[PDB]
Amino acid sequence: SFSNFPISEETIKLLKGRGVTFLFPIQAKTFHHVYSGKDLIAQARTGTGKTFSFAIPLIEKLHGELQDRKRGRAPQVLVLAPTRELANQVSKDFSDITKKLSVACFYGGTPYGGQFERMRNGIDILVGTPGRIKDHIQNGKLDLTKLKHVVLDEVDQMLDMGFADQVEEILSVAYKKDSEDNPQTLLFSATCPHWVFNVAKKYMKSTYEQVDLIKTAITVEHLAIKCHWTQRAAVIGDVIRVYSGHQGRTIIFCETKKEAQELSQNSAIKQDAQSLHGDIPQKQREITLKGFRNGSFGVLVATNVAARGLDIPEVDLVIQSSPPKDVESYIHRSGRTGRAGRTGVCICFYQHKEEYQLVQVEQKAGIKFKRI
Ligand SMILES: Nc1ncnc2c1ncn2[C@@H]1O[C@H](COP(=O)(O)OP(=O)(O)O)[C@@H](O)[C@H]1O
Numbered sequence: 527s528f529s530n531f532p533i534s535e536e537t538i539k540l541l542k543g544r545g546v547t548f549l550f551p552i553q554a555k556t557f558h559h560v561y562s563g564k565d566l567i568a569q570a571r572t573g574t575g576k577t578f579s580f581a582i583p584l585i586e587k588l589h590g591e592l593q594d595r596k597r598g599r600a601p602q603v604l605v606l607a608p609t610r611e612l613a614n615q616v617s618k619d620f621s622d623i624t625k626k627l628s629v630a631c632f633y634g635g636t637p638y639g640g641q642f643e644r645m646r647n648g649i650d651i652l653v654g655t656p657g658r659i660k661d662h663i664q665n666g667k668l669d670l671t672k673l674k675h676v677v678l679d680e681v682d683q684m685l686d687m688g689f690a691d692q693v694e695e696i697l698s699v700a701y702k703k704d705s706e707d708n709p710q711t712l713l714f715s716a717t718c719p720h721w722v723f724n725v726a727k728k729y730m731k732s733t734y735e736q737v738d739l740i741k742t743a744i745t746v747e748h749l750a751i752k753c754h755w756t757q758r759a760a761v762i763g764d765v766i767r768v769y770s771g772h773q774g775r776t777i778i779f780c781e782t783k784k785e786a787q788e789l790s791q792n793s794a795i796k797q798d799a800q801s802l803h804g805d806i807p808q809k810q811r812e813i814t815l816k817g818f819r820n821g822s823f824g825v826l827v828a829t830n831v832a833a834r835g836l837d838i839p840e841v842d843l844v845i846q847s848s849p850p851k852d853v854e855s856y857i858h859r860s861g862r863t864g865r866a867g868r869t870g871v872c873i874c875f876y877q878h879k880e881e882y883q884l885v886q887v888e889q890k891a892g893i894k895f896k897r898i
């Protein structure tokens with residue numbers, strides 16, 4: 527339900543056709559900022575709902591404001607996205623939830639004439655890629671001097687791809703006034719490097735708001751699996767398939783060389799595993815780590831002895847064979863899990879006689895395990 531937000535019954539019915547029945551956190555925490563006219567930078571992980579976080583409050587805003595839509599009117603909202611595929615998706619999301627507003631999407635690799643006719647007939651929300659939008663400014667057909675809202679979607683990707691200069695050329699036309707008359711500026715992305723914000727800041731009022739759901743996100747899950755030591759190898763095979771699977775990276779830490787050597791020879795993982803312990807001379811240790819990084823094998827079994835000082839690559843899954851005594855090392859290893867934006871998984875095995883040790887790890891690391 528939508529009781530906390532000024533969303534009309536018409537919009538709610540369209541949202542149901544898209545499977546939307548309540549607002550995700552990034553949407554709920556940004557609605558009032560966007561709707562009330564504040565400049566905003568919002569950061570949330572990929573897939574968490576950034577598109578509707580700007581599209582729903584903007585559409586409700588325009589539905590209240592643009593009661594008299596004349597032929598030829600200039601857009602009120604501009605959304606720049608870095609690829610044709612991303613621009614199309616954002617435009618589709620707008621046009622699925624408003625049947626009142628004129629929504630247009632301008633990208634390259636497509637005819638100019640149809641875009642000319644959208645501009646002649648009138649546009650309320652313009653979505654596009656920077657290149658084609660800049661072309662239409664230069665050819666004199668697109669009027670961006672009456673914008674009230676500007677969205678830079680996936681702004682990190684957009685500037686990484688080289689669009690800073692084209693974006694600045696487009697926005698220079700729309701921010702010709704002093705601040706109070708400038709468009710509201712909305713930035714949405716999963717990251718915002720320093721150098722990207724240094725570009726965008728030029729278009730943000732000093733009063734801008736920030737919603738960062740990255741800093742509060744659960745990016746590493748801690749699981750504790752109660753297990754007799756004889757079953758560990760078979761369970762390790764299962765959790766590797768679940769959480770690392772194809773093309774994955776797993777590192778297993780154990781106490782003794784015998785455990786590390788036997789675990790790496792166990793038919794549950796042997797075909798994809800190499801071991802690392804204090805008997806291995808430096809040169810082969812280095813060779814083994816290069817093969818772990820370059821995909822030669824997917825499971826590294828290391829004694830806590832060999833792991834002291836070792837530089838740990840990013841991995842999908844960390845497994846501790848028993849609750850670690852060196853919680854500092856555990857905290858460090860857990861921070862290495864989760865690749866390509868995915869949530870990392872750390873698994874601690876434990877036996878009945880080790881259950882209080884799990885509580886000690888929880889206290890010393892300030893975490894809580896999910897017990898399985
Ligand atoms: N409140 C919601 N309820 C249900 N599905 C949603 C909601 N918000 C977004 N989605 C869906 O989640 C998916 C990801 O949304 P998207 O805006 O692409 O995420 P992001 O831009 O954060 O990567 C889309 O299929 C979208 O329609």
Ligand SMILES: [Mg+2]
Nearest residue numbers: 576577679680
């Ligand atoms: Mg998005």
